Amino acid sequence: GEIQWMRPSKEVGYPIINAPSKTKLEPSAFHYVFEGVKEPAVLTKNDPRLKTDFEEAIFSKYVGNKITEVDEYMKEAVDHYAGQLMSLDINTEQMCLEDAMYGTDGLEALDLSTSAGYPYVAMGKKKRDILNKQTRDTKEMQKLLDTYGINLPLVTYVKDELRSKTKVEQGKSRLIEASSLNDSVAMRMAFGNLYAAFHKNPGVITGSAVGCDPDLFWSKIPVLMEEKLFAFDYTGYDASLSPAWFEALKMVLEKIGFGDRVDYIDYLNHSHHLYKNKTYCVKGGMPSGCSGTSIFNSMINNLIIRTLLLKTYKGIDLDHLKMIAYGDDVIASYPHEVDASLLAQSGKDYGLTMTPADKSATFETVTWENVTFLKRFFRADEKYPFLIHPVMPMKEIHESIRWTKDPRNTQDHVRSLCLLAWHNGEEEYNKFLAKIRSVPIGRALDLPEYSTLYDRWLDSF
Ligand SMILES: Nc1ncnc2c1ncn2[C@@H]1O[C@H](COP(=O)(O)OP(=O)(O)OP(=O)(O)O)[C@@H](O)[C@H]1O
Ligand code: NA
């Protein structure tokens, strides 16, 4: 990913974008009851915490494009993956605007919360006026589509979230590249069935984990994997992607019945952005807020791992590559051990920066004891080991609970964290509940008891 040019949105007929300059994250009732070291991300150039230019930093993610064409390996990678997907018998038809707007089996309705994007964001018009569940009225949207068309600029916001002190001082705030309700709808109509098939099929055939339910899915994964697990982390995956990987992606879509509209992929690759008062053009890089960012990122990651394997181990049997990805995150396996470090090397050549799994100092042997996926670990239940516990570190929860954006969502926020934490074990969960109930706010929450959660879990399978 790389920015071709950037300039005053006025110089090209685009209005300025008002981006709130103050975070919505303030200390929560449990701020001093739990330990945390994260603070809200820098939102403006002025943040006294900054130690380098904000503009430079928030864009540093676009390290450039490393490859040009789609080589032999990539092509083979494409064939193999496209091969697997073929077996899912994916419906290639388009999705009727209605099902695409309000949802259908395999696809959730649009999220009334997220930005409507341009031009609406600048017109004040919000989704709540265009959509409206009850009737599933296509008319207003249908109208707006003809009126404003598609392939509209991406509105860019700084993501308001908790970050390390380092990523605070270094202005390393993440950015949200929001898509227009139109493009979002168009794409959902174009790929809606692809999206559905993936959500309904997390596993090693789609190589996707998108849509998955950790509480159930974790037990299925170990069975799907091969003997030897191999993993690593990406650094700026999304932004590091080069045009070639997008072309490779289209080659797959094409091979499975979507050549029809692979054009949509072109705007993810080459895209138009509006950030504040400026406008820029990016070559490469997967935008964060588009319909299908997750899935396409996962499909591409599936192409990548195959590639680096075909390029490093001539003769490698891709059919025994069992991997599951969720955007840049991934968990893979092969009958034989492989060198993560070696693969990471071939990676640089493809414009990917790969480092030891979970910020390890070095690439080490991946095991069921240390491997993570979505920050979560794998732990077989003591009483019934054939049931695997998706285990997220308590630290992650402690951090999240020390802050709040809205007091009205405290019940929901804590309840959620509880559904995550209890997997750490009864002793741990109860200490957690104890502390929560050590201040007025918590004592007023409707939190589930361990035994309740654990039994429900057992029956869920
Ligand atoms: N608006 C967004 N919302 C959600 N996720 C985003 C958004 N923008 C980018 N991302 C994701 O976050 C990633 C970057 O997160 P992060 O700042 O932690 O960088 P990192 O590469 O993980 O750093 P490190 O290599 O040191 O671990 C992107 O590659 C992309 O997957
Ligand atoms: Na882009």
**Ligand 1 centroid distance, CA of 174 (Å):** 6
The Cα-based distances of 90 to 85, 94, 107, 199, 205 in angstroms read 8, 12, 14, 12, 12
Structure tokens at 144: 């707006």
Structure tokens at 53: 């230019």
Q: Is 98 in contact with 136 (CB distance < 8 Å)?
A: yes
Nearest ligand to residue 232 Cα: 1
Q: How far apart are CA 262 and CA 207, in angstroms?
A: 20
Residue 350's nearest CA partner among 155, 63, 11, 136 is 63
The Cα-based distances of 204 to 99, 132, 209, 223, 366 in angstroms read 27, 37, 9, 10, 18
Nearest CA to ligand 1 atom 30: 238
Amino acid identity of residue 164, one-letter, is S
- Which CATH superfamily does the domain covering 213-242+292-367 fall into? Reverse transcriptase/Diguanylate cyclase domain (3.30.70.270)
**Ligand 1 centroid distance, CA of 102 (Å):** 29
395 alpha carbon, distance to own chain's centre: 21
Q: How far apart are CA 41 and CA 23, in angstroms?
A: 8
Q: For residue 212, what are the contacts with CB-CB under 8 A and spacing of at least 6?
A: 202, 326
Domain ranges of the chain: 1-13+70-202+243-284, 213-242+292-367, 375-461
Amino acid identity of residue 294, one-letter, is S
Residues written for the chain: 461
Residue 426 exposure: Cα atoms within 13 Å on the Cβ side: 7
Residue 329's nearest CA partner among 294, 367, 303, 366 is 294
Q: How far apart are CA 290 and CA 242, in angstroms?
A: 17
Q: Please, which residues have CB less than 5 A from ligand 2, an ion? A: 271, 282, 285
Nearest CA to ligand 1 atom 27: 235
Q: For residue 31, what are the contacts with CB-CB under 8 A and spacing of at least 6?
A: 402, 403
375-461: CATH class: mainly alpha
Binding-site residue positions: 233, 328
Q: How far apart are CA 136 and CA 387, in angstroms?
A: 40
**Ligand 2 centroid distance, CA of 162 (Å):** 25
Residue with tokens 């071709």: 4
Nearest ligand to residue 177 Cα: 1
The Cα-based distances of 320 to 4, 109, 304, 315, 317 in angstroms read 40, 36, 16, 12, 6
Nearest ligand to residue 1 Cα: 2
Residue with tokens 């964060």: 288
Q: Is 211 in contact with 200 (CB distance < 8 Å)?
A: yes
Index of the ligand 1 atom closest to the CA of residue 177: 1
User: What angle do helix axes 139-148 and 181-199 make, rounded to 10 degrees?
Assistant: 120
Enter the resolution in angstroms.
Answer: 2.6
Amino acid identity of residue 233, one-letter, is D
Structure tokens at 84: 């697997």
Euclidean distance between the first and the last CA atom of the chain, given in angstroms as a whole number: 42
Structure tokens at 92: 């290639």
Q: How far apart are CA 60 and CA 172, in angstroms?
A: 8
Torsion of CA 210, 216, 220, 225, to 10 degrees: 50
Residue with tokens 């002190």: 165
Q: How far apart are CA 58 and CA 370, in angstroms?
A: 32
Q: How far apart are CA 109 and CA 102, in angstroms?
A: 4
Quick check: CB of 375 below 6 Å from ligand 1? no
- b/e for 40-53, b at 16 or more Cβ within 10 A? bbbbeeebeebeee
Three-class HEC string of the chain: CEEEEEEEHHHHCCCCCCCCCCCCCEECCCCCCCCCCCEECCCCCCCCCCCCCHHHHHHCCCCCCCCCCCCHHHHHHHHHHHHHHHCCCCCCCCCCHHHHHHCECCECCCCCCCCCCCCHHHHCCCHHHHCCCCCCCCHHHHHHHHHHCCCCCEEEEECCCEECCHHHHCCCCCEEEECCHHHHHHHHHHHHHHHHHHHCCCECCCCECCCCCHHHHHHHHHHHCCCEEECEEECCHHHHCCHHHHHHHHHHHHHHHHHHHCHHHHHHHEEEEEECCEEEEEECCCCCECCCHHHHHHHHHHHHHHHHHHHHCCCCCHHHCEEEEECCEEEEEECCCCCHHHHHHHHHHCCCCEEECCCCCCCCCCCCCCCCECCEEEEECCCCCCCEEEECCHHHHHHHHCEECCHHHHHHHHHHHHHHHHHHCHHHHHHHHHHHCCCHHHHCCCCCCHHHHHHHHHHHC
Q: How far apart are CA 192 and CA 97, in angstroms?
A: 10
Binding-site residue positions for Mg(2+): 233, 328
Quick check: CB of 172 below 6 Å from ligand 1? yes
The structure was resolved experimentally with X-ray
Task: Mark residue 236 as left, alpha or beta (left: phi above 0; alpha: psi -120 to 50; beta: remaining).
Answer: left
**Ligand 1 centroid distance, CA of 238 (Å):** 7
Nearest CA to ligand 1 atom 19: 236
Quick check: CB of 236 below 6 Å from ligand 1? yes
Quick check: CB of 235 below 6 Å from ligand 1? yes
Residue 339 exposure: Cα atoms within 13 Å on the Cβ side: 10
Q: Is 42 in contact with 50 (CB distance < 8 Å)?
A: yes
Nearest CA to ligand 1 atom 23: 235
